[PDB]
Every structure is written in C-alpha cells, then in structure tokens.
C-alpha cells in the first residue's frame, strides 16, 4: 500500500513534461521580451530539447 507501479506511459509522460519545462521557459523568456508584432509559434518552440 506504499509502493506503486510507474509503468512506461507515466515515465515517458514525465520525461516529456520535464522536456516541456525547458521550452515553456524559452517561450516565456521570448514573450516576456517585447517585439511581439511579428512573432509566430515557430521560433519560440524548439524541438531539440524535446
């Protein structure tokens, strides 16, 4: 009652989300900086950390 399975789905989901933490940090940095008149969801996102 104190130990649990953490199967392949949940582990991959958590590694996905800790990947997403970096890219949401990146987009929050980019959007917290100005110059938003030309931005598109292509440069703030970056699939290399993911």
């Amino acid at each position: 009652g104190n130990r649990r399975i953490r199967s392949v789905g949940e582990m991959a989901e958590n590694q996905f989300r800790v990947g997403l933490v970096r890219v949401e940090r990146a987009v929050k940095e980019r959007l917290s900086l100005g110059d938003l008149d030309t931005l598109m969801p292509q440069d703030m996102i970056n699939a290399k950390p993911i």
Partner: protein
C-alpha cells in the same frame, strides 16, 4: 500568400510609402491645385440640343441614353 512574419508585406509597404511620399511631383501638383483652384461649369441648352437630337438619324438604346 505572405508567410507570417515574412516582412515582405512590410518591405512593400515601406516601398509604396516611399512612392507615396508627398514630395511626388507627378500628382501632388494636381492635389495642390485641387487645394487651390477650381473648374468650369457647362451651361445646358434645352432647345438647340433638341435640334442636334433630331440630327441623330437613329434611335438611342436605353443603356446609351442614360450614359
């Protein structure tokens, strides 16, 4: 289809605005006399014009009479 953030629309807008600069002497002299001068008014003849209407040896079409 200007891709978003492609800036070609901005570049063309700036280029057109350069062409649309009010130093353009091609039409801003026309707009200056538009802001300074006027035109002539023709007077109509209700009677002699009917003589040349009768000098017209056909019948006017309805779409040409309104023209």
């Amino acid at each position: 289809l200007h891709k978003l953030g492609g800036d070609a629309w901005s570049r063309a807008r700036q280029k057109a605005a350069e062409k649309v600069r009010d130093v353009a002497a091609e039409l801003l002299d026309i707009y200056a006399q538009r802001a300074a001068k006027e035109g002539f008014a023709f007077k109509h003849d209700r009677e002699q014009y009917q003589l040349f209407c009768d000098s017209f040896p056909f019948e006017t079409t309805p779409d040409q009479a309104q023209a």
